[PDB]
Design a binder for this molecule. Sequence first.
Ligand code: PKQ
Ligand code: PKQ
Lengths: 115, 115
Amino acid sequence: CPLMVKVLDAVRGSPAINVAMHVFRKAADDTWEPFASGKTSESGELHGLTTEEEFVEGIYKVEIDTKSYWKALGISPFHEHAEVVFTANDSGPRRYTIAALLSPYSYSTTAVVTN
Amino acid sequence: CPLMVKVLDAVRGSPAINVAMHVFRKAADDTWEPFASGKTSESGELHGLTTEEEFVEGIYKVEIDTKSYWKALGISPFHEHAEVVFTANDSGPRRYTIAALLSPYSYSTTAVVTN
Ligand SMILES: CCc1oc2cc(O)ccc2c1C(=O)c1cc(Br)c(O)c(Br)c1
Ligand SMILES: CCc1oc2cc(O)ccc2c1C(=O)c1cc(Br)c(O)c(Br)c1
């Protein structure tokens, strides 16, 4: 599993469940092409987005639909989405965990990169 | 000053100085058109991006060039940039401060919306 996303809710102290996200990859003409998508499970995790063979070097964008998450909880949040843009696999294959901790007016994001 | 951006450095415990950023407004065709830009001051702040008359309701993106900041310090970063995408909404008088706290592999962003 070369790309995993984990989302937590800082208001409830819980995984953020059923959060949709779309992953894009920058094409040679500098446009964002669709790459993968999914939603978080009961654990707040989204696994299985890609494979080692498909997840080539490139610039990737993870767009996490945080606004829909908060709206369903009755909250009108600040951000439209949380965006995570990064170069992947520039020194060979790595495994990436993208993590996001969500509040209505704030989010924090980090990455855990392992070889 | 309806929109200000403040950037801090979590490795050095200091304002993040000379950080470049661009602000975009989402257009009718779903493209991002340039709106304003600048670099943070010695206090880590960027003032004077827009005026109350120009800062109408809509979806705005602040793209902060965090990669160049870390590169200038000789530190290898994860993100290409930090992206803050939000809707501006007229609910009485509002001033927006977008704040970002930067680490090489993580950032946190919040909004302080005041009257
Ligand atoms: C979305 C996950 C996450 O994002 C953060 C942002 C922060 O600033 C501080 C903490 C977190 C955080 C975690 O608590 C967390 C991460 C992993 Br990885 C994990 O396995 C488990 Br359990 C918990
Ligand atoms: C309480 C201030 C604060 O706490 C954080 C926690 C985070 O994880 C990330 C960022 C912040 C953060 C700021 O960016 C901030 C700092 C100053 Br100083 C300031 O004047 C303004 Br406005 C905003």
